[PDB]
Design a protein around this ligand. Structure first.
Ligand SMILES: Nc1ncnc2c1ncn2[C@@H]1O[C@H](COP(=O)(O)OP(=O)(O)O)[C@@H](O)[C@H]1O
Ligand SMILES: [Mg+2]
Lengths: 145, 145, 242
């Protein structure tokens, strides 16, 4: 129902104007990525989905799809004068993801669905630790992105 | 600046005397000052002179001046490397036809005015094997463009 | 005193260029790229800049007839000197003349990008270099007989002790085609552009060459040195008009 409902009904997803891709991704290619993202998300939370009730499971499976869908079309989004402008346009159209909603003053990317919490908790980054590595390219700082 | 100098200076007189202008006139050169200036430069040149001659006006003068042991070798000729090497050793003068642009890497060490002196003899490195360099060697590069 | 004698003007702008090359060599892993017109002194400024710091400069010698395998053997020899633990960091000098064909550049960019060109030596030869670095790793206090972090540490050392200096001229679209063709060169190395010598610098050049020549009151010298700068500048203004 979710696959069928998000591609057919949304003209905005397939609209060249609304979503600006870096490379001209084919429809089939974006579906293949959703599936492979959804796969890994089910294996990790398979035991939790059985313990949960069918009502909160039905929300959780939709959420998993949105997150997976977001990222499967998220990556391709970029290019132009400003990347930020193309993201904000894509953020807006995808923000209407049926019954499930995203918290305000955050990008759809920055939020991931937590099964236990069910609150779409933003990505937590580890505060950088100083290292005695001589090369600067070796030194790796973590970012939200 | 007020540097000690003669009241009436002209470049033609300094570069060459009046008598040698009268010699050149006989060797297919016009009496216009621009051509005398040009003829006066190549005489005083500390570098190898690359000449641009549409209507082959320069080439006719060069052939007149170098009456004896003048050899004209185009870039297209297959034994031009072998001819130049044998010419450098014992050649009064050398003339290179064509060489319009993109000058061959084999000429680059020759084009350089710096030469290596091994005891009494002077050695210039062109191609795989170094060739013995003799004094009073002249090299003229004519290009029709 | 020790190396081959090099004469240079050592004007303010040339000295600034020595300073900011010495700076790029002081940074570990980072490579220097010098871009300028033919005769800008950059090759001679690099050799000087290298010597100022505690580094040993090695330039390849190109014969008229040269082969890709001959280049690899010259590079291979340099990597044996870097591999030893108690080694001064080897600088590598390259010019447009030294690059006789575009095939000779391919190995150099894979070196300068990261570590050392893939399959430069055999696997058995690499193992013998790794064992020599293992003695150093014990002193450093890095994990030994891991055969993953050690091999990695070897690549870090090789990167730190190899510096790659490139010299091109931005006169044709050939250098631009090098940039397009070779991705590693422009992004990995630190570009340095040589502008033409200022009017004030040109005066000092003339003032240096006029020294040890007889003159009536040596006021002529000081004036000629100005006129030498004025004539060269007035050609560039006429060349812009032309
Ligand atoms: N500042 C300077 N003072 C004196 N001679 C110089 C100076 N700069 C360059 N030269 C001379 O001109 C040559 C220029 O060649 P090089 O240093 O390789 O530079 P490039 O790579 O720009 O040709 C030097 O080798 C040296 O003989
Ligand atoms: Mg040079």
């Amino acid at each position: 129902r979710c696959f069928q409902s998000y591609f057919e009904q949304n003209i905005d997803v397939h609209d060249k104007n609304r979503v600006r891709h870096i490379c001209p991704m084919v429809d089939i290619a974006m579906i293949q990525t959703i599936c492979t993202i959804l796969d890994a998300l089910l294996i990790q939370h398979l035991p939790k989905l059985k313990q949960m009730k069918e009502e909160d499971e039905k929300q959780a499976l939709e959420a998993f799809f949105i997150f997976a869908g977001l990222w499967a079309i998220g990556g391709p989004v970029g290019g132009g004068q400003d990347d930020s402008k193309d993201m904000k346009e894509f953020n807006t159209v995808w923000k209407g993801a049926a019954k499930v909603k995203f918290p305000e003053q955050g990008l759809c990317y920055d939020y991931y669905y937590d099964i236990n919490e069910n609150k779409w908790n933003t990505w937590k980054v580890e505060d950088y630790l100083p290292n005695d590595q001589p090369l600067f390219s070796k030194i790796y700082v973590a970012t939200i992105h | 600046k007020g540097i000690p100098i003669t009241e009436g200076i002209e470049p033609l007189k300094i570069l060459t005397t009046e008598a040698i202008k009268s010699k050149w006139k006989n060797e297919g050169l016009p009496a216009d000052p621009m051509s005398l200036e040009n003829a006066a430069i190549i005489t005083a040149c500390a570098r190898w002179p690359l000449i641009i001659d549409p209507q082959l006006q320069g080439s006719t003068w060069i052939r007149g001046k170098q009456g004896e042991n003048l050899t004209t070798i185009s870039l297209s000729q297959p034994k031009w490397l072998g001819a130049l090497t044998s010419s450098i050793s014992s050649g009064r003068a050398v003339l290179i036809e064509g060489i319009q642009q993109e000058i061959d890497a084999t000429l680059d060490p020759l084009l350089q005015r710096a030469v290596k002196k091994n005891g009494n003899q002077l050695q210039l490195e062109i191609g795989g094997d170094p060739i013995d360099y003799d004094p009073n060697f002249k090299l003229f590069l004519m290009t029709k463009l | 005193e020790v190396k081959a004698q090099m004469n240079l003007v050592l004007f303010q702008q040339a000295m600034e260029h020595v300073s900011r090359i010495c700076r790029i060599l002081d940074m570990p892993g980072n490579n220097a790229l010098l871009v300028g017109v033919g005769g800008s002194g950059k090759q001679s400024l690099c050799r000087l800049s290298t010597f100022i710091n505690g580094f040993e400069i090695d330039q390849l010698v190109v014969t008229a007839s040269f082969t890709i395998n001959d280049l690899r053997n010259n590079l291979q020899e340099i990597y044996k000197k870097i591999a030893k633990p108690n080694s001064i960091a080897r600088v590598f000098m390259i010019t447009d003349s030294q690059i006789k064909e575009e095939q000779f550049l391919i190995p150099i960019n894979d070196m300068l990008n990261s570590g050392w060109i893939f399959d430069l030596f055999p696997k058995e030869d690499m193992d013998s270099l790794v064992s020599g670095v293992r003695n150093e790793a014990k002193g450093e206090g890095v994990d030994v007989n891991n055969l993953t972090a050690l091999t990695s540490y070897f690549l870090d050392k090789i990167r730190k002790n190899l510096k790659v200096v490139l010299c091109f001229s931005p006169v044709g679209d050939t250098m631009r085609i090098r940039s397009r063709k070779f991705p590693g060169i422009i992004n990995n190395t630190s570009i340095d552009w040589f502008h033409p010598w200022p009017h004030e610098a040109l005066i000092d050049v003339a003032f240096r060459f006029l020294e040890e020549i007889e003159f009536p009151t040596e006021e002529i010298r000081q004036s000629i040195s100005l006129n030498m700068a004025k004539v060269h500048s007035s050609i560039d203004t006429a060349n812009e008009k032309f």
